């Protein structure tokens, strides 16, 4: 792909984070802690899952960023509406305001309803995410495999400002402690 020139500098919004997440000083890395991280509750925090939003809001234009997923067993990545539900249980779907892919139990899937199987021959260590607001497109790229396409959501109905979306996943196994990291431009 040739989307690299739309690169944006994403930082994580501490206030949106689940209370078990640990965000680095530079706001560019996040991981699951082994306990509550001693923060106050607020209406922005994702309560049920290890999720956090980027601070940036997008309502026009073309945007690109990259995320490092090295040695993780489970994660979700993409974008979401600013107004997504924060509390309780919900599915990641465009109907609920999410445009995402994930790794779970050694398979990759797109967050459609119902979910779509992805075909990835080279397990990615870094994921590229491209958003074209005007066109209604969210695309995912395998940076480890020379930028090959993973998935395109088209005919997206964003219906609001978009925020970068992250889920570090649970660590029930002891094999999923590694962070998500925003990769440098």
Ligand X SMILES: CO[C@H]1CN(Cc2cncs2)CC[C@H]1C
Q: Where are the beta strands (DSSP E) in 91-179?
A: 98-104, 107-110, 116-117, 126-132, 137-142, 148-153, 162-167
Rounded to a whole number of angstroms, the minimum distance from the CB of residue 32 to ligand X is: 8
Interface residue with ligand X, options 11, 14, 15, 49 (CB under 6 A): 49
Tell me which stretch binds ligand X (CB under 6 A): 44-52, 54-62, 101-109, 138-146. 44-52
* Tokens of residue 65, six digits: 């960023």
Residues contacting 85, CB < 8 A, separation 6+: 96, 97
Coil, strand or helix at 63: strand
Q: Output 69 or 168, the one with its CB closest to ligand X.
A: 168
Vertex 150 angle, CA 119 and 120, to 5°? 30
Q: Output 56 or 85, the one with its CB closest to ligand X.
A: 85
170 binds ligand X (CB under 6 A): yes
Interface residue with ligand X, options 37, 48, 59, 83 (CB under 6 A): 48
The interface with ligand X within residues 82-121 (CB under 6 A) comprises: none
Binding site for ligand X (CB under 6 A): 18, 20, 48-50, 170, 172
């Amino acid at each position: 792909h040739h989307h690299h020139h739309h690169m944006v500098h994403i930082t994580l919004d501490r206030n949106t984070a689940n209370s078990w997440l640990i965000i680095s000083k530079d706001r560019r890395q996040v991981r699951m802690g082994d306990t509550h991280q001693n923060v106050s509750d607020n209406k922005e925090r994702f309560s049920n899952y290890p999720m956090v939003l980027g601070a940036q809001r997008f309502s026009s234009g073309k945007m690109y960023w990259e995320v490092d997923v090295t040695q993780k067993e489970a994660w979700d990545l993409g974008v979401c509406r600013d107004s997504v539900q924060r509390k309780g249980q919900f599915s990641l779907s465009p109907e609920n305001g999410f445009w995402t892919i994930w790794l779970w139990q050694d398979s990759y899937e797109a967050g459609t309803s119902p979910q779509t199987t992805l075909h990835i021959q080279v397990p990615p260590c870094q994921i590229g995410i491209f958003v074209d607001y005007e066109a209604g497109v969210v695309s995912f790229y395998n940076i480890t495999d020379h930028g090959s396409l993973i998935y395109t959501f088209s005919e997206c109905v964003f219906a609001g400002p978009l925020r970068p979306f992250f889920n570090v996943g649970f660590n029930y196994s002891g094999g999923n402690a590694a962070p998500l990291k925003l990769c440098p431009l």
